[PDB]
Amino acid sequence: YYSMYLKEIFVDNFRNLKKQKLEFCEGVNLIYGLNAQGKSNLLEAIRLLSMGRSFRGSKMSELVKFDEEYFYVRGLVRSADFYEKKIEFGYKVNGNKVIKVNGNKLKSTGEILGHFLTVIFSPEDIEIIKEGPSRRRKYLDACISVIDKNYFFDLLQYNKTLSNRNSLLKKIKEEGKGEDLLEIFDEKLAEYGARIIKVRNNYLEKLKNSMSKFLMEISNEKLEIIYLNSAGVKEVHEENLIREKLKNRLTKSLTLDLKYLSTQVGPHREDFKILINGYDSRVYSSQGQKRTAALCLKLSELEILEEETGEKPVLLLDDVMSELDDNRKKYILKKLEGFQSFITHTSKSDVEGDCCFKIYDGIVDKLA
Amino acid sequence: AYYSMYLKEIFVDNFRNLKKQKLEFCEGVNLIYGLNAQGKSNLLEAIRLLSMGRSFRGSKMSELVKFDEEYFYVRGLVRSADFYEKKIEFGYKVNGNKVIKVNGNKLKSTGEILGHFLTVIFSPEDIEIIKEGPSRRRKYLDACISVIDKNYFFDLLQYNKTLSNRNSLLKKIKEEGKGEDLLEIFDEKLAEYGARIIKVRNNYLEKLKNSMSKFLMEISNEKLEIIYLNSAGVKEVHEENLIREKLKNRLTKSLTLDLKYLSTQVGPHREDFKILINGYDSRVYSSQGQKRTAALCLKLSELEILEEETGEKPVLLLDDVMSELDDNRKKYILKKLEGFQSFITHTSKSDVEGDCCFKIYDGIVDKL
Ligand SMILES: Nc1ncnc2c1ncn2[C@@H]1O[C@H](COP(=O)(O)OP(=O)(O)OP(=O)(O)O)[C@@H](O)[C@H]1O
Ligand SMILES: Nc1ncnc2c1ncn2[C@@H]1O[C@H](COP(=O)(O)OP(=O)(O)OP(=O)(O)O)[C@@H](O)[C@H]1O
Ligand SMILES: [Mg+2]
Ligand SMILES: [Mg+2]
């Protein structure tokens, strides 16, 4: 076995939170407080060790406590083949992200991906159903990159090239009516986009299969995922084929690209649709049935993460115990066995955690 | 004591999942209840359509049409302070034809429906006003004001019309030459309208500030302040004579920017107002329930202001706002609802048991 595990966390100058070191027990860490406390703030610091950014999309500026110049998070983690691993996040108001794993500072922020695995269940996950393709596309990358460093690299390269190619368009439109030498980037974008498309396709087939079963078991509704990729393909097939399609679309779209100084073809503007019972759930569905869609989305994220990486993530549940009754809660609890849980709530006298913490002014306090 | 706004009956034909029917409601608390995805919000949406001329959810007209149909039609009979029974009729055929009639008479422009039937709608998706972009806020401010202020709503139409006008001149200046002369006037026009909007917007925001504080004070004890980032940088001013120049002013300085982006950059279509809670911008730093509180307050204040500037007393649409309560506020605000017509959606018949209650299933509403 040997599942993941946040042994302890130390946070200095982090958001609301006073400077403190907290030790956690594996299983369910109930955390209760009241809107000026830092429940979500703790959960944030924890995921920061996992992704190296805020799950609430916040600037690393705002993580820094009011009127300070820096903040520091340290965490002690057990992987499956790691008895103990130290992850360190430090930021100063200079603009210096510093990230050490076992004393060894990391080259780029992205290398923090993988060392500590979390799945964060936020009620704001509902936005992946509701917002535009940008929100869904980001989410998609985040799911894959935590599983596949290859995909991550390709993304980064892809964007660099895209950004270069955009500059080159600017100069072409204005300073010289013709560069064919735009050809070299088109070729590069096509070659990278195709690998990106081919991997996204691979993830989404899994999400189809996985979410379908959840969506079916939960509410008897038929799930369907439609990947709106840049190749314009219904089935995905050969990476080579995608490469040739992307390149062509890139040639035929030049004019539009010169009108806008943007690149219209490419995985930087794909999207997937989530059809519940044949209809777009972004356009046609009940609040409650968007909620359910988002829930199965998260379930599948987790299920796939265990499947692909042999590890069992640390589950963070922020403000979900609210929307539930009593037998529906211990039901959920029972599904959380093999996992270390960090669960925020608002009452202690309700859900019985393997150890729990009251939090009042930014100070965590065990067994209360 | 004037007669409250009161919705006697509604007829819906081909409106979302809702069957063809005519329902008759109570002066008082109409409790609409049912399982989810049955049509409670749809129904609430049809109501507010009569009040607002569009979907409160932002959906587009074509999507309101029942699936695989050619039109939809809604009829309301309302009692205002000066009316015993007013007909408001709304129809849309999927050829894009919008048709509104009040008491038989087809209205000239859709906007003219504003003010006849007065509703205030409270949904959980009100949080978004606190924590999305300047779009969401600017727009909700426009909606709030235009309902009370027929005049402003005309100002606004005329602003966006010559704004769009101006931006098409920009695509004929740095693209095709000349255009210099004709440019002079638009700036005067944009500045004339703009300053109307600004004075009025400021008016409402001062009222918003005052009312909201009083609420936010009573409810969570936090201190509210409100900053109106007007387009004329004239923080803390009140005389339209001068704001016209500043806009005419800033509109010249930003000429080359304007030309670079082919958009206009200075005016009230780029404004926003910040909702500070205890000194801190709540877009950025507020908690979650800290926004649930900020939202409810925003709404409460809307209702309050609305009552006192129209001399009416709106219908209250309470969309799925009652799941998340404690019975010490659920049996409370029920008392607060007394003088008004409430539509309250829920999923349980058991005690939110107001003055009347219908049960909806499969788009059909029966009365117990
Ligand atoms: N940089 C910061 N410095 C200090 N406090 C901050 C900072 N950013 C956010 N906060 C504060 O954190 C406080 C509450 O923390 P958090 O954001 O975790 O809410 P919460 O206690 O989890 O409550 P809820 O149940 O409402 O989610 C808020 O009052 C907010 O102003
Ligand atoms: N144009 C349409 N034609 C047919 N059905 C639609 C249309 N638009 C939305 N629906 C469907 O209406 C059903 C219910 O809509 P609505 O949002 O009113 O559900 P709801 O009753 O609000 O859910 P809840 O019961 O949680 O309030 C959903 O299944 C939705 O997919
Ligand atoms: Mg929270
Ligand atoms: Mg709904």
Numbering used by the authors:
A (entry chain B): -2 to 365
B (entry chain A): -3 to 364
What do the paper's sentences say?
We determined the crystal structure of the TTERecF-ATP complex at 3.0 Å through molecular replacement by using TTERecF monomer as a model. In the TTERecF-ATP structure, four RecF monomers formed two dimers in the asymmetric unit. For each stabilized dimer, ATP acted as a fastener that linked domain I of one monomer and domain II of the other monomer and was located between RecF molecules directly opposite to each other. The contact surface area between the two molecules of the dimer was 5863 Å2, which was 17.8% of the total dimer surface area (32919 Å2). In addition, the two long α-helices (αD and αE) of the domain II of two TTERecF formed a channel, within which numerous positive charges and hydrophobic residues were distributed. The diameter of this channel was approximately 20 Å, nearly similar to the dsDNA diameter. Two ATP molecules were buried in the positively charged tunnel of the RecF dimer interface. ATP interacted with the Walker A motif of one TTERecF and with the conserved signature motif of the other TTERecF. Mg2+ in the active site binded to ATP β- and ɤ-phosphate O’s and two H2O molecules. The TTERecF-ATP dimer structure displayed the closed reaction state of TTERecF for interacting with ATP and even for the complex interaction with DNA.
RecF is a multifunctional protein involved in recombinant DNA repair, homologous genetic recombination, and DNA replication. Similar to RecR and RecO, RecF is a recombination mediator protein (RMP) in the RecFOR pathway for ssDNA gap repair. RecF contains the conserved Walker A motif, Walker B motif and signature motif of ABC-ATPase that exhibits ATP-dependent dimerization; additionally, the signature motif residues interact with the ATP bound to the opposite molecule. To gain insight into the mechanism of ABC-ATPase RecF, we solved the crystal structures of TTERecF, TTERecF-ATP, and TTERecF-ATPɤS.
